[PDB]
Design an enzyme around this catalytic site. Structure first.
Site, short mmCIF file in Angstrom:
data_model
loop_
_atom_site.label_atom_id
_atom_site.label_comp_id
_atom_site.label_asym_id
_atom_site.label_seq_id
_atom_site.Cartn_x
_atom_site.Cartn_y
_atom_site.Cartn_z
CB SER A 152 -8.76 9.10 -47.64
OG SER A 152 -8.46 10.15 -46.75
N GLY A 153 -9.51 7.89 -44.50
CA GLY A 153 -10.39 8.04 -43.36
C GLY A 153 -11.08 6.78 -42.85
CB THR A 157 -3.39 5.64 -39.48
OG1 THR A 157 -2.56 5.78 -40.62
CG2 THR A 157 -2.61 6.18 -38.26
CG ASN A 199 -8.01 11.10 -41.69
OD1 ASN A 199 -8.22 11.57 -40.57
ND2 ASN A 199 -7.29 10.02 -41.88
CB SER A 202 -4.93 12.76 -44.33
OG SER A 202 -4.73 11.95 -45.47
CB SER A 203 -1.08 8.51 -43.54
OG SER A 203 -1.53 8.02 -42.31
N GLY A 449 -4.58 6.02 -48.18
CA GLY A 449 -5.74 5.41 -48.83
C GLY A 449 -6.35 6.12 -50.04
CD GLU A 451 -5.75 11.66 -51.16
OE1 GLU A 451 -4.90 12.41 -51.71
OE2 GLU A 451 -5.92 11.65 -49.91
N1 LIG Z 1 -11.06 2.10 -34.00
C1 LIG Z 1 -11.18 3.44 -33.88
N2 LIG Z 1 -11.50 4.00 -32.69
C2 LIG Z 1 -11.64 5.33 -32.54
N3 LIG Z 1 -11.47 6.22 -33.54
C3 LIG Z 1 -11.13 5.79 -34.79
C4 LIG Z 1 -10.97 4.34 -35.03
N4 LIG Z 1 -10.64 4.21 -36.33
C5 LIG Z 1 -10.60 5.45 -36.89
N5 LIG Z 1 -10.88 6.38 -35.96
C6 LIG Z 1 -10.98 7.83 -36.23
O1 LIG Z 1 -10.97 8.02 -37.65
C7 LIG Z 1 -9.97 8.97 -38.00
C8 LIG Z 1 -9.39 8.53 -39.34
O2 LIG Z 1 -8.78 7.25 -39.17
P1 LIG Z 1 -7.31 6.93 -39.78
O3 LIG Z 1 -6.87 5.60 -39.22
O4 LIG Z 1 -6.50 8.18 -39.64
O5 LIG Z 1 -7.74 6.80 -41.34
P2 LIG Z 1 -6.82 6.27 -42.56
O6 LIG Z 1 -7.53 5.03 -42.99
O7 LIG Z 1 -6.78 7.37 -43.61
O8 LIG Z 1 -5.49 5.97 -41.94
C9 LIG Z 1 -8.99 8.91 -36.84
O9 LIG Z 1 -8.23 10.11 -36.64
C10 LIG Z 1 -9.86 8.65 -35.64
O10 LIG Z 1 -10.47 9.89 -35.23
O1 VO4 Z 2 -6.68 9.65 -44.84
V1 VO4 Z 2 -5.49 8.20 -44.94
O2 VO4 Z 2 -5.93 6.77 -46.09
O3 VO4 Z 2 -4.30 9.04 -46.20
O4 VO4 Z 2 -4.27 8.05 -43.55
MG LIG Z 3 -3.56 6.82 -42.19
#
Ligand SMILES: Nc1ncnc2c1ncn2[C@@H]1O[C@H](COP(=O)(O)OP(=O)(O)O)[C@@H](O)[C@H]1O
Ligand code: VO4
Ligand SMILES: [Mg+2]
Length: 762
Positions: A152-153, A157, A199, A202-203, A449, A451
């Site tokens: 997670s985070g 996404t 996050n 979070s998705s 992810g 968690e």
């Molecule tokens: N390549 C990137 N560039 C800028 N910010 C990022 C990047 N990857 C992640 N982030 C930041 O990290 C936060 C969490 O990433 P996200 O893709 O939502 O996590 P998850 O793996 O749970 O999907 C995002 O909302 C954004 O603020």
């Molecule tokens: O914080 V995520 O792995 O559920 O999008």
């Molecule tokens: Mg996500």
């Protein structure tokens, strides 16, 4: 030991630079750099050779002088400090979350620079993996999947969106639906993403987004599959988390006209929001654009939540603009908002025990308004709603409900309605970019992810099980099938031993004795019990490696029949099993289903139709196995996302936290395999056959194996870069550009290489 700096353990950095002073029998004596005298001990096992230049980095970790977990870690760290978040391990990409916006690396100009480029000819980048999937789709005539993993985070996404932007902008049409696959996102995130403590975005559901192509390899459409929306969040959150975004986006950004028509107010006014955090994401400016009547007391006292990406008011605007770009009309938009507001008011209905004999409960008099708004917004008769919430049909007779049961009914109605709304949203998105036929697709997988929290329940159990299935696909495709191929072909590569998790999967999903089947059994018993289910699990799996009884604290602890520990590939998690039985049942009571299907509003009815027990666990298993079947049939590429620290801050590389992720993801195992392995391969008879018709009557035409060798030499390879097996020839890491030239089938290219080959065989 003679006589260089080495890497040795360090509790927070993972590894640290030191010098070998004294050499014992089982342990070495280490002096940390610049501390002479303050030595410490380390087992010989735990010490590794270092790269000689510590300030330099390489783009592919297979290029390191020493391939090991400490040099991999350092190389990633150095690239991170230079804001270079992407690095290869052969053809697998590692992505560390920067937690800020790095200028220009996702720009249109950058997109253009990666098009048609072989791996290794541009810096590591998510665009390069995407371009690779497209090139393989054409050349191999094979659908492709890009799997993005991580806890997670970690950035799954965000990287999924980068991949989708790259493919639609590069290989789309420049017309309409090119944008549509991309512009759908803010719509799905508004309904399916929420603030968790890991996050802010979070998705809470998983997705597989497919881009479909015609035979000329241009985008004809898309399809989004979605998996298990988290239901409990709809009605209750923890003090630092929120409900789904759309609720706050609406409260923050709706016009006064819409606020009044939906009878909305500040988030503290709704049970379904007010146990959670009721603050908006906002900055100094956007806070001015949010009206006072929208702000809760918590917000006025503590101020806004901060995120470099999220902004409730701004995201409401972007979300509406997105709805219009993809062809949603204003009528459909307001229909969606109506259901959202209707679910809010529903949660404000309260009950009180009734005076009568064999009496249940009545709506509290102060709930009269919420009942009214709710019924209007959902197209229902107040009296019908009232009766469905406070009584139950059961033989023909109506039974009064007690207050708790009415509470449960209210919430079950709210969960089903919101969940069907989400299904409606995904299907409407699919209608935005439909297609009649396609040749191949590129799919991008983005799951919720790994968690865990202080208390973990059925929700985390399902999410982590999904992560376990995905890691097993990675294990199967990259670590198991690869080594088996090397063996069937006679290559003699040193077996690499790795951590498999099929046993964790069997524990959960095996027939009759798997956790999911035992749970279903319990739902079907006369008197179902969380405690009975939990005991049966421990009984059926006494002494399994992946299951454990909770350990008991003397500093509240969890009894044998109140939970269990699962040792997931990413670490052990302790689950409390209360409510596992109720959460495992997806069926909605007839009286509630019927209430909804008789709404005055067509839109509401069409969310549902144009002891009943249904298993949540097993339905989810079935969906994931269908997904798995589809992935197995494609060429798979992998992006491993890494979370750099636990505070969501930029430039804080936590070495030990990151090392642990590199270890359990299997990336350390892959690096080991790439010491002697071969990420590319082709049938040599097939290479020969493709060239044959351009070949004159010379030595080259008579002997396929010798022809391939000459071809390899003509493109710059030597003996060390490849190896012939029984039926395929294999290529070492670092030769992707040459491998692409070998595979290329353009007639002019073939004729040119034939001319060169004949010179090599004269
Ligand atoms: N390549 C990137 N560039 C800028 N910010 C990022 C990047 N990857 C992640 N982030 C930041 O990290 C936060 C969490 O990433 P996200 O893709 O939502 O996590 P998850 O793996 O749970 O999907 C995002 O909302 C954004 O603020
Ligand atoms: O914080 V995520 O792995 O559920 O999008
Ligand atoms: Mg996500």
């Amino acid at each position: 030991e003679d006589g260089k700096p080495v890497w040795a353990p360090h509790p927070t950095d993972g590894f640290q630079v030191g010098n070998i002073v004294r050499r014992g029998p089982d342990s070495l004596t280490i002096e940390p750099l610049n501390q002479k005298g303050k030595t410490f001990l380390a087992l010989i096992n735990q010490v590794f050779p270092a790269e000689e230049d510590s300030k330099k980095d390489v783009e592919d970790n297979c290029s390191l002088m020493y391939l090991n977990e400490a040099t991999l870690l350092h190389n990633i760290k150095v690239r991170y400090s230079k804001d270079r978040i992407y690095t290869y391990v052969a053809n697998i990409l590692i992505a560390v979350n920067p937690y800020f916006d790095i200028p220009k690396i996702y720009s249109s100009e950058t997109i253009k620079s990666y098009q048609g480029k072989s791996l290794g000819t541009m810096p590591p980048h998510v665009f390069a993996i995407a371009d690779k999937a497209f090139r393989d789709m054409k050349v191999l005539k094979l659908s492709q999947s890009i799997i993005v993993s991580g806890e997670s985070g970690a950035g799954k996404t965000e990287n999924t969106k980068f991949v989708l932007r790259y493919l639609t902008e590069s290989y789309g049409t420049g017309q309409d639906i090119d944008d549509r696959i991309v512009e759908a996102n803010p719509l799905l995130e508004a309904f399916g993403n929420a603030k968790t403590v890991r996050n802010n975005n979070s998705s809470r559901f998983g997705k597989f987004v497919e881009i479909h192509f015609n035979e000329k390899s241009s985008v004809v459409g898309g399809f989004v599959s979605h998996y298990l929306l988290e239901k409990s969040r709809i009605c209750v959150q923890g003090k630092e988390e929120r409900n789904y975004h759309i609720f706050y986006r609406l409260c923050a950004g709706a016009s006064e006209d819409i606020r009044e028509r939906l009878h909305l107010s500040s988030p503290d006014n709704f049970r379904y929001l007010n146990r959670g955090c009721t603050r908006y994401f906002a900055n100094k400016e956007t806070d001015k654009q949010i009206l006072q009547n929208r702000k809760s007391p918590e917000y006025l006292k503590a101020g806004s939540l901060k995120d470099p990406l999220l902004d409730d008011h701004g995201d409401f605007i972007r979300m509406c603009t997105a709805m219009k770009k993809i062809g949603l009309d204003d009528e459909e938009k307001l229909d969606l908002f109506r259901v959202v507001a209707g679910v809010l008011h529903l949660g404000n209905i309260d009950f009180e025990e009734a005076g009568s004999t064999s009496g249940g409960c009545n709506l509290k008099n102060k709930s009269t308004q919420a009942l009214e708004y709710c019924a209007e917004l959902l197209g229902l008769d107040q009296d019908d709603l009232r009766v469905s919430l406070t009584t139950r049909v059961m033989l023909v007779i109506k039974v009064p409900l007690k207050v708790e049961q009415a509470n449960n009914a209210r919430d079950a109605l709210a969960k089903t309605v919101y969940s069907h709304l989400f299904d409606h949203v995904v299907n409407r998105v699919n209608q935005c970019f439909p297609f009649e036929t396609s040749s191949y697709f590129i799919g991008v997988l983005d799951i919720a992810g790994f968690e865990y929290f202080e208390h973990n329940s059925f929700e985390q159990f399902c999410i982590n099980y999904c992560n376990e299935k995905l890691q097993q696909f990675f294990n199967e495709r990259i670590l198991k099938e690869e080594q088996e191929l090397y063996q069937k072909e006679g290559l003699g590569v040193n077996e690499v031993h790795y951590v498999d998790n099929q046993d964790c999967i069997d524990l959960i999903e095996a027939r009759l004795v798997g956790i999911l089947d035992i749970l279903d059994e319990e739902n079907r018993l006369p008197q179902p019990s969380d405690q009975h289910f939990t005991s049966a699990v421990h009984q059926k799996h006494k002494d399994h490696f992946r299951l454990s009884i909770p350990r008991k604290s003397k500093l509240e602890n969890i009894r044998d029949d109140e939970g269990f520990i699962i040792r997931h590939f990413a670490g052990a998690v302790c689950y409390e099993t209360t409510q596992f039985v109720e959460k495992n049942n997806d069926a909605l009571h007839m009286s509630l289903e019927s209430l909804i299907c008789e709404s005055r509003d067509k839109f509401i009815r069409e969310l549902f139709e144009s002891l009943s027990f249904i298993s949540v666990g097993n339905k989810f298993k079935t969906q994931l196995n269908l997904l798995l079947d589809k992935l197995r049939s494609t060429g798979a590429s992998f992006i491993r996302c890494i979370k750099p620290n636990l505070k969501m801050t930029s430039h804080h590389f936590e070495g030990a936290q990151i090392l642990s992720q590199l270890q359990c993801s299997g990336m350390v195992s892959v690096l080991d395999l790439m010491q002697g392995g071969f990420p590319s391969r082709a049938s040599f008879h097939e290479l020969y056959n493709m060239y044959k018709k351009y070949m004159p009557d010379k030595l080259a035409r008579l002997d396929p194996r010798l022809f391939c060798k000459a071809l390899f030499k003509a493109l710059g390879l030597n003996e060390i870069d490849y190896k012939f097996g029984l039926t395929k020839v294999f290529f070492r890491p670092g030769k992707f550009a040459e491998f692409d030239q070998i595979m290329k089938s353009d007639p002019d290219h073939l004729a040119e290489l034939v001319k060169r080959v004949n010179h090599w065989l004269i």
